[PDB]
Amino acid sequence: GAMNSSNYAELFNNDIKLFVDDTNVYRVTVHKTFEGNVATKAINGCIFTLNPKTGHLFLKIIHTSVWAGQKRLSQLAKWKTAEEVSALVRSLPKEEQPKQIIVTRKAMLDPLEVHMLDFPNIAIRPTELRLPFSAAMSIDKLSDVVMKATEPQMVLFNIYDDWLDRISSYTAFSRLTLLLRALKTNEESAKMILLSDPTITIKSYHLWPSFTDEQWITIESQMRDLILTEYGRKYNV
């Protein structure tokens, strides 16, 4: 059934699972035409497929060429997502294939179920969690590889950098969701908090800065304050 607050620890057990977020698959800018009508121009997108236990991220870049001459793109985007997730599962060795795939949006359930009919033992699940994976394109190195792609491409990342050397998967996921929640609520302020000290850099092979354990506590506090500062505006409370 649905993944919620009640069964949260299940994310970090030894059963291989993937989160799939389709938010950033079909991306457009809306603009005026010469005649004063409205039109969209697609930009490169991505499927965000994440092992929450290991941090392994399968970033399938969706090149604007896949939409050329297609109709009902927001519908097609769900099916293309499910096609590419199914292709990724088939590409993995049997012992690496997930036992569950959790979709962040309920509209992915039927498309993914139909694409995974060959895998009846892989459970396709929704979640009640409101996950901030839409904000993946606020991570500079992910945004950069998506925008520069000239063709369909799969890029492999570890979204936790080397954090699992020092912290558990549970704590790494909590840190990732807090960073993405801050980047989603106020991108400018979140990026300012992450780069304010020039002495702390991002390793070439990493996504996030090389914070000490004490610096991560300060950063995480500054992110929580940002989310509350922002919430006390949205709602005037």
């Binding site: 097609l76 099916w79 499910a82 694409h115």
Partner: protein
């Protein structure tokens, strides 16, 4: 015009013959139903006064033998049996008729209701859905489960309706996932019509049989089958024109016949709203849409 005699009526019972029904009192001198129209299947059905649980009955065709009803006090039901001695049977019927101990199948000459509900229904197709090959007639009741319901437990007592499942390898060609899910035409036309049913007449026969089992016995699995066969057509962008026209007539008579008070349990909101208002065939069921809108506007 054929006859189904009753040995007796030892228990108080409501007796159905097709869309008609009669209350019989305990030990009332009732000895059967005469003037049954030749050329159609028929269903004789029962609901005991003392336990309205288990509606049950028998699908039969009087062209296929001489059938009678006899109460079994051990199994506690009215049973259909075949009389193999023609002369004994003719002599039983002639006596009961002479003593006018038989109700007359009460068909109004103008009334094509039963033909319209059973147009594609054939005894030989019923006997493959309801497997009991030693009898020429078929027992159905309120509680019998379908092969599909059983998959998701006594196989000999199952309704072997054709399994329809929109999220199955059968329904979805590898490589045409989105196309086949959103447009069921390949599942309807290649798999079901060309493949399994062989023609639209057998498909409509099963659809009509499923509805009648839903209506006459409150058989839940039959209602599921009726709705799945409607949805498969309405969810196909490519359906022969003759099939759409015939479907509209079929559904019109089914909705016309349904007791007004059973719309809540026998009609699936999602399927009917989707079929009449969102599906490919939303504009192809004029008669059905008009009777549904006038008779059941709450459901929609």
């Amino acid at each position: 015009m054929n006859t189904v005699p009753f040995t007796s009526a030892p228990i108080e019972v409501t007796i159905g013959i097709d869309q008609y029904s009669f209350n019989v009192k305990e030990n009332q001198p009732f000895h059967g139903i005469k003037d049954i129209p030749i050329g159609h299947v028929h269903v004789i059905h029962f609901q005991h006064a003392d336990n309205s649980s288990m509606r049950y009955g028998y699908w039969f065709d009087c062209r296929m033998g001489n059938f009678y009803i006899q109460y079994d006090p051990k199994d506690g039901l009215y049973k259909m049996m075949e009389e193999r001695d023609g002369a004994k049977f003719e002599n039983i019927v002639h006596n009961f008729k002479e003593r006018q101990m038989m109700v007359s199948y009460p068909k109004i000459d103008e009334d094509d209701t039963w033909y319209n509900l059973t147009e594609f229904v054939q005894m030989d197709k019923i006997r493959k859905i309801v497997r009991k090959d030693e009898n020429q007639f078929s027992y159905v009741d309120s509680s019998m489960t379908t092969v599909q319901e059983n998959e998701l437990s006594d196989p000999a007592h199952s309704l072997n309706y054709t399994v329809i499942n929109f999220k199955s390898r059968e329904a979805i060609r590898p490589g045409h996932e989105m196309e086949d899910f959103l447009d069921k035409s390949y599942y309807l036309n290649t798999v079901m019509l060309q493949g399994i049913f062989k023609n639209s007449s057998n498909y409509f026969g099963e659809l009509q049989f499923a509805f009648l089992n839903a209506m006459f016995f409150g058989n839940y699995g039959s209602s599921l089958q009726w709705h799945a066969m409607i949805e498969l057509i309405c969810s196909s962008a490519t359906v022969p024109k003759h099939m759409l026209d015939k479907l509209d007539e079929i559904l019109y008579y089914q909705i016309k016949t349904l007791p007004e008070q059973y719309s809540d349990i026998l009609l699936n909101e999602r399927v009917w709203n989707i079929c009449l208002y969102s599906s490919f065939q939303k504009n192809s069921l004029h008669n059905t849409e008009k009777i549904m809108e006038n008779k059941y506007p709450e459901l929609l």
